[PDB]
Amino acid sequence: MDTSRVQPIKLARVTKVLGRTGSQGQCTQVRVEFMDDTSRSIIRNVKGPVREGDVLTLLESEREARRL
Amino acid sequence: AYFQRPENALKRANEFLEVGKKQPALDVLYDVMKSKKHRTWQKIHEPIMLKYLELCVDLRKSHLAKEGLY
Amino acid sequence: MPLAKDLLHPSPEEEKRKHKKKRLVQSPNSYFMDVKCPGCYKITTVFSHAQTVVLCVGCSTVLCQPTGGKARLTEGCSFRRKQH
Amino acid sequence: EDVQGKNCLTNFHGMDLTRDKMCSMVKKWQTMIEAHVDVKTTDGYLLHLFCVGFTKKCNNQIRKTSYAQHQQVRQIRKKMMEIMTREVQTNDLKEVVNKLIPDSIGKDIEKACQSIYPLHDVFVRKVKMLKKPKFELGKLMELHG
Amino acid sequence: MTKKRRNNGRAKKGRGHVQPIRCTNCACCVPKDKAIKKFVIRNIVEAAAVRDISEVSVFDAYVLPKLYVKLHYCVSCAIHSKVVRNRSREARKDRTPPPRFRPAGAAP
Amino acid sequence: MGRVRTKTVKKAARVIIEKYYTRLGNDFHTNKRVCEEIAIIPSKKLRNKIAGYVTHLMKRIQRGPVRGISIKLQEEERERRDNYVPEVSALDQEIIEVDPDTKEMLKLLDFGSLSNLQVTQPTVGM
Amino acid sequence: SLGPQVAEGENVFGVCHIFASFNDTFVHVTDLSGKETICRVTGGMKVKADRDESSPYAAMLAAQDVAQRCKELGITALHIKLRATGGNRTKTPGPGAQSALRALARSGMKIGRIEDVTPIPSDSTRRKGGRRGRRL
Amino acid sequence: MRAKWRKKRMRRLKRKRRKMRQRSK
RNA sequence: CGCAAGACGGACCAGAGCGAAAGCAUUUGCCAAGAAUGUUUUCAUUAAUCAAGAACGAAAGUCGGAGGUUCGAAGACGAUCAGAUACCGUCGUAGUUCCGACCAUAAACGAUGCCGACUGGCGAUGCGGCGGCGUUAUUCCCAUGACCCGCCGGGCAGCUUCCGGGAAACCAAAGUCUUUGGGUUCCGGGGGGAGUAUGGUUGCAAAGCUGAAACUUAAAGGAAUUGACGGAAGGGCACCACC
């Protein structure tokens, strides 16, 4: 009725980098492992320069990337 | 694909028998004994072969009881 | 074609497997036959492509059947050409 | 059809089939074969069954087609009606259902048409109960006995 | 008058008229023999959501159904969506379909 | 980065290995000093390159034969494969028999020995 | 909110009726029969912009609420029926089909079955747009 | 389209001449 | 969840089939018609192409009735634009459908007359006939079914090349042409003026068919080749480009 009830702050880590996307190469596709489930994996779009094995701070895993 | 839990062969086999068809109910039973389901004796393979050889002798098919036992 | 081949004298059936009006002499591809089954104990003579029912005078009253070409006989042997 | 003290009793109304199964069987280089009949039971129930057949991709074709003549098809349709009227005109409402659950009906057609073209697949994609008789409480409770 | 293609860009042989089909994207009328036909078989569920659906499903091993869509494109929509590309004079004679993955197993 | 070797290096590198195969080691420094004595390379930086490629080739020449240049011992083993192979000395195993329709040819050409019969089924792919 | 008097080892199965395509997403949870029903939420109610009504997160945010009121009542499991628009139209799912499932499943609700249902003609009336169709 | 229009403007013009001559008599 | 109305035959449906062409896909029956193949049947030159004349002939349109779901010229609105009588969104008449009369036109395109003869190779597909080592159906066994292999007709097409031709693109025909002649019909003469003028004819209407000149001009046009250009496609690159 009022506002919303939301999920708590998640943490998920890179397994591999895929390639860069966006219309100036500013976005980066990446595969990430959920860091609580080792068989779960989602693809994301991440802005900043990333290497591999570093951890992110996802606000949701409802969202999922495709290409555009 | 086909089947799963190879135990479904009995169900069909049983379903066709309530109509009175032992020619296809059996076929379904044989379609399993010979297939990817060669996991050497799951516990359900005995009731399959017991029904299979009952129908073989209920219609008279030795060359099928041979392949079944083989 | 090897572009030098003979045409005077052809092979017995490797150059007489051709269509019958594309041969050097025109031959039929049909024949007669002397029959005499039991259903009708008589020496009947019948053409290979019957085109019509051939009748019998015995217990039977049918011998042939006209299909789309040759003719399907029956349970009675009786066969010959003879010669042609 | 009836309510009885917080328990709702049911009655047959007709069967249908999924989409994906019906779609997956349909494919290029086959000839689809279809027919229906209107049919009456021994009782007052009336049904309108819809069946289907598909041609077989044959034993050891090197050909990339499985198409059939038009003459051959109209035989297969005629013989698919003949079977499905014999087994449903006789044999009351419940015995119909009993034959369709393992699919004995469809399997019987597959072998009976085998000589004039082998065929793999027979299913009854729909049945539509069109008319039905009176409630008949005595006949009703037989089903829930 | 120069003839770019022996087939005039369609599969009409020994026939006077062919029923038109509507393009899936732009609704334009296109002859059934000129339309670019793509059969798309997809799982109803996307590969990422398969795990969550298997964990929440009451059945231990549910076989997920497939969507069967026959897409019909006009030539313009098929070029814009990059379904068909421009080919050289010689490579237009080639009718081999481009190789896809390999096969319908696993990753693709 | 970059620094893909030019043709001037790859031309003379092959030549220098063919005619001074023996002098080569597999160390950089030794292969440098040899190239300095068996030829003059008019630059210093050029010399440091041609040595390094001569080294990199000599690694592969100690495996199977290179297809850009020849050495003597490979043409030895070439000759040794190409004058007898250990597989046969017999022709082919001395007796091989054939199936009919070949026998009919041989019947009409005065031969009538060393045959078998099998009359394999009809037909192509069937 | 009063549920049934047992659901301890069994589940109660509703039907989810997810709607697909563009400019709209519905999620409308009903009975097994579908005769009567419960809450019904749209992506135009979660997000107001008249252009994010078909977006993934708008479909997820919808089902993230609807799935609460299910379990609040006693509906714990869901059979799923899909609907793309069809009727000689696009006849292909929108974006917010994949989306809502991923969100509602992980919220805690069980999934029982899933299927495609779309109204597909056996050839029917002419489609809006004319012979030359839309351009620009 | 261009030629099909040039044939059309001259069609309506021809029709007008017919009417105008039929009007004159 | 049930009912009504009108429209329409998906996927299956293909360089597949049938028809003179225009065209022709739900079931079952009836009515007449036709091609190909088979034949040691019949007739005995009965043929080929065509002024006159004749039948059929998409869609739109016209006249009189029925019907009118859907789409929709016209028209009324909402946006976009300096302008926007447009592209886009909403509504919507005629029309779209059926019955009976008219209208004779299309990129009615293979932009390729019809009939006949001769001249390469190869693999397929639809139909008929014939020949065959075998699997396969059933009643247990050569009824005729499916699959395999080969052969003979005519049909829609494809691949291949120093057949030969062509300006080239291309084409086993557009080939067998200065080494020119198998038979026959129709039709063309630089570009505009003009399918206009005019008279004839047909039509209820809309128009169709038949069809000039005065005057003007040295180019119009084809393939074909090389460049440049593209709000064409695929790769690659730059802080004088961007992030």
Side-chain angles (χ1 to χ4, degrees), chain A residues 6-68, chain B, chain C, chain D, chain E residues 1-99 103-108, chain F, chain G, chain H:
Chain A
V6 304
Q7 269 320 339
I9 309 298
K10 296 297 188 297
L11 293 172
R13 56 183 301 280
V14 175
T15 303
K16 181 175 178 180
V17 59
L18 298 174
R20 301 179 70 104
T21 52
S23 300
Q24 294 82 20
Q26 56 183 359
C27 298
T28 301
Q29 292 186 357
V30 66
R31 178 175 291 178
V32 294
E33 173 181 354
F34 195 64
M35 200 180 168
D36 296 293
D37 295 296
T38 188
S39 300
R40 187 175 180 184
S41 185
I42 55 184
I43 301 176
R44 299 297 299 140
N45 290 323
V46 178
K47 181 181 175 181
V50 286
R51 183 175 66 258
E52 179 177 357
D54 56 0
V55 187
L56 302 176
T57 308
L58 300 176
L59 298 178
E60 62 180 10
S61 51
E62 183 178 294
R63 188 71 281 176
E64 193 176 6
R66 207 278 74 151
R67 60 121 236 316
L68 156 63
Chain B
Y2 216 23
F3 279 148
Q4 332 227 356
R5 332 178 163 242
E7 23 116 11
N8 295 325
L10 222 161
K11 267 141 76 326
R12 253 99 183 315
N14 286 306
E15 276 173 344
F16 286 108
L17 282 161
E18 195 167 16
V19 185
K21 314 242 180 276
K22 27 186 84 174
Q23 26 282 27
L26 149 156
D27 239 294
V28 179
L29 282 180
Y30 172 65
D31 270 322
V32 175
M33 298 328 291
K34 188 142 158 276
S35 172
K36 66 160 232 202
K37 227 154 311 327
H38 268 190
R39 276 78 60 78
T40 44
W41 183 59
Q42 282 191 9
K43 283 296 294 285
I44 201 62
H45 273 284
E46 271 195 30
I48 287 177
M49 185 51 66
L50 290 180
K51 174 62 74 63
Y52 178 89
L53 296 181
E54 181 160 49
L55 292 167
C56 283
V57 181
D58 250 32
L59 273 174
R60 326 200 303 134
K61 300 235 158 133
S62 58
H63 65 293
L64 263 167
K66 197 310 116 155
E67 292 296 334
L69 284 178
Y70 174 37
Chain C
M1 287 290 289
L3 308 172
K5 200 175 67 60
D6 300 296
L7 294 169
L8 282 72
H9 297 291
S11 296
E13 59 178 0
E14 186 57 62
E15 298 184 6
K16 296 181 183 297
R17 61 179 190 179
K18 302 296 185 178
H19 186 268
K20 62 184 186 298
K21 304 194 75 178
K22 299 186 180 64
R23 293 175 184 160
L24 301 174
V25 291
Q26 299 186 359
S27 299
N29 291 328
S30 54
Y31 57 113
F32 300 94
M33 47 180 180
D34 301 300
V35 199
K36 181 209 169 38
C37 50
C40 190
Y41 295 96
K42 296 180 178 62
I43 309 178
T44 311
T45 307
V46 181
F47 186 56
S48 55
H49 304 282
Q51 201 173 288
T52 55
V53 180
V54 179
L55 301 173
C56 287
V57 186
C59 54
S60 51
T61 189
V62 56
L63 183 58
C64 233
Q65 215 209 321
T67 72
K70 259 165 243 254
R72 281 210 294 104
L73 305 298
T74 88
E75 315 231 320
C77 267
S78 158
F79 251 146
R80 301 296 183 274
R81 297 179 63 83
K82 178 182 178 298
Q83 190 179 354
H84 300 87
Chain D
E1 208 175 5
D2 197 54
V3 186
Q4 292 186 352
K6 303 174 75 284
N7 295 287
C8 300
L9 301 180
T10 51
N11 286 92
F12 189 60
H13 186 253
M15 55 182 70
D16 278 355
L17 186 59
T18 56
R19 290 194 180 271
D20 60 294
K21 181 62 177 180
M22 193 59 196
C23 291
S24 60
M25 294 186 289
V26 178
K27 56 183 70 179
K28 303 299 300 299
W29 308 104
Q30 291 183 344
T31 300
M32 187 173 185
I33 303 178
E34 295 181 4
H36 58 87
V37 287
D38 296 293
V39 68
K40 191 72 175 182
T41 59
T42 59
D43 305 299
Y45 296 94
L46 199 152
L47 298 170
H48 187 174
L49 291 80
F50 291 89
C51 200
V52 59
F54 290 94
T55 52
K56 186 174 289 181
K57 179 71 178 184
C58 304
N59 307 294
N60 291 292
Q61 296 184 348
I62 298 178
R63 291 168 64 194
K64 289 80 178 178
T65 188
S66 302
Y67 295 157
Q69 299 184 355
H70 181 68
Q71 191 63 255
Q72 295 182 357
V73 168
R74 196 168 60 84
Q75 297 181 359
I76 295 168
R77 292 182 290 191
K78 191 61 61 178
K79 193 174 294 299
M80 185 161 71
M81 291 189 288
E82 181 59 59
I83 294 172
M84 197 163 65
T85 48
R86 186 174 65 254
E87 298 181 294
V88 181
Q89 187 60 62
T90 56
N91 304 304
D92 62 357
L93 193 278
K94 182 60 65 175
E95 294 180 0
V96 182
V97 178
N98 297 346
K99 291 171 186 297
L100 288 167
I101 291 170
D103 1 293
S104 300
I105 300 297
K107 185 61 179 64
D108 193 60
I109 300 161
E110 190 176 359
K111 188 178 178 65
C113 298
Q114 193 174 7
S115 299
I116 57 174
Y117 205 83
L119 307 177
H120 72 292
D121 286 307
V122 183
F123 291 87
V124 278
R125 57 184 181 182
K126 292 186 296 300
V127 179
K128 297 194 293 179
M129 187 178 288
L130 184 57
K131 294 296 183 65
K132 56 181 181 179
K134 194 174 182 297
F135 183 66
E136 299 178 4
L137 185 57
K139 188 63 174 64
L140 190 278
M141 294 304 298
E142 185 275 301
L143 285 74
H144 302 284
Chain E
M1 250 262 271
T2 56
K3 189 178 189 174
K4 188 175 187 173
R5 296 185 174 100
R6 187 178 179 190
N7 73 341
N8 305 347
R10 72 184 182 192
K12 197 176 176 182
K13 297 295 176 182
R15 294 188 300 269
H17 182 262
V18 180
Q19 288 174 338
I21 296 176
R22 299 291 178 164
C23 183
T24 49
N25 290 28
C26 66
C28 296
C29 281
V30 187
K32 174 173 184 179
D33 66 307
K34 190 177 181 185
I36 296 161
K37 303 177 186 159
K38 187 179 181 180
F39 199 61
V40 178
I41 309 174
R42 288 175 181 180
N43 295 349
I44 291 170
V45 183
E46 200 211 334
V50 174
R51 292 183 179 179
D52 310 336
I53 292 181
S54 54
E55 289 174 16
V56 178
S57 60
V58 184
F59 303 110
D60 295 322
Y62 187 67
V63 182
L64 291 170
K66 297 180 183 173
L67 296 177
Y68 295 95
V69 187
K70 187 176 260 161
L71 300 171
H72 291 296
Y73 297 107
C74 76
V75 180
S76 313
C77 291
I79 293 167
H80 183 74
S81 59
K82 305 173 183 174
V83 175
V84 179
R85 299 182 184 174
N86 290 0
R87 294 187 286 164
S88 72
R89 186 183 179 207
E90 293 170 4
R92 284 165 194 167
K93 294 181 180 176
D94 190 4
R95 297 189 182 188
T96 61
Chain F
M1 302 298 178
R3 307 283 84 185
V4 174
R5 303 182 182 95
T6 53
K7 58 189 174 294
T8 59
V9 178
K10 300 190 183 299
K11 285 289 182 180
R14 291 180 180 113
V15 174
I16 288 169
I17 292 168
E18 186 171 62
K19 309 188 302 184
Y20 293 97
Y21 186 61
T22 53
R23 305 295 181 85
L24 305 174
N26 292 98
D27 311 309
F28 177 64
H29 294 286
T30 58
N31 292 348
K32 189 172 67 62
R33 298 291 185 180
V34 170
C35 295
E36 191 178 357
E37 184 174 60
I38 63 95
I40 51 175
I41 298 171
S43 300
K44 187 175 181 180
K45 182 178 178 181
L46 189 55
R47 185 184 68 197
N48 298 119
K49 289 179 178 296
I50 293 171
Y53 189 47
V54 164
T55 304
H56 177 66
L57 283 170
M58 190 60 187
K59 297 300 196 68
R60 302 174 65 249
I61 294 167
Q62 295 179 352
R63 299 175 61 252
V66 293
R67 299 179 293 179
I69 196 61
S70 297
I71 56 171
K72 296 181 273 68
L73 305 175
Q74 292 176 1
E75 295 178 357
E76 189 280 301
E77 194 270 353
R78 183 65 277 170
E79 199 287 307
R80 191 168 64 201
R81 296 297 84 190
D82 190 357
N83 57 357
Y84 177 71
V85 288
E87 301 182 356
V88 288
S89 296
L91 175 56
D92 297 302
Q93 57 178 8
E94 198 173 4
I95 308 178
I96 295 184
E97 297 86 3
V98 291
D99 284 351
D101 301 302
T102 307
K103 186 56 181 296
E104 271 59 69
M105 299 293 95
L106 296 167
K107 184 177 66 178
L108 301 169
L109 293 172
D110 304 297
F111 182 90
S113 54
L114 297 168
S115 299
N116 289 341
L117 291 87
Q118 181 58 56
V119 287
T120 58
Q121 286 291 298
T123 181
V124 190
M126 198 66 177
Chain G
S1 188
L2 183 58
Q5 300 181 359
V6 56
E8 300 180 357
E10 61 178 5
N11 291 296
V12 184
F13 285 83
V15 176
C16 196
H17 299 278
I18 300 105
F19 185 71
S21 63
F22 305 95
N23 305 310
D24 185 60
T25 302
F26 281 98
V27 180
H28 184 200
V29 180
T30 60
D31 294 355
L32 184 59
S33 51
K35 191 72 188 303
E36 302 193 359
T37 183
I38 58 170
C39 307
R40 174 172 52 81
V41 176
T42 55
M45 186 189 309
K46 301 295 93 178
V47 181
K48 300 178 182 178
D50 304 300
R51 64 189 181 187
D52 296 299
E53 305 186 359
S54 54
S55 292
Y57 64 107
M60 292 168 173
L61 289 164
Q64 192 177 358
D65 291 298
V66 175
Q68 187 174 358
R69 280 65 177 177
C70 295
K71 295 180 287 180
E72 191 178 358
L73 182 57
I75 309 301
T76 47
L78 291 169
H79 299 300
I80 293 163
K81 291 180 184 174
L82 198 64
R83 182 172 182 247
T85 303
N88 198 4
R89 294 297 299 172
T90 188
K91 62 175 289 186
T92 300
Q98 185 182 14
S99 303
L101 301 181
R102 185 180 173 88
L104 75 89
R106 292 192 287 109
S107 72
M109 292 197 78
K110 298 294 290 178
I111 308 298
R113 283 192 174 89
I114 184 164
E115 58 178 1
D116 184 76
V117 180
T118 297
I120 300 172
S122 297
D123 210 56
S124 296
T125 59
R126 192 172 180 167
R127 183 181 179 183
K128 188 174 71 67
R131 184 178 178 78
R132 295 167 63 182
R134 298 184 64 203
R135 55 289 192 190
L136 192 279
Chain H
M1 304 309 293
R2 192 273 182 274
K4 185 168 65 177
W5 300 137
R6 189 172 183 269
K7 196 180 68 164
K8 190 168 189 174
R9 61 188 294 171
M10 189 173 64
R11 178 175 283 110
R12 59 179 65 181
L13 181 57
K14 185 176 175 179
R15 184 172 59 189
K16 190 180 71 179
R17 295 174 180 177
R18 186 189 295 126
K19 184 181 176 182
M20 181 272 290
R21 185 272 303 142
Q22 183 275 316
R23 176 266 181 189
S24 295
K25 294 182 291 183

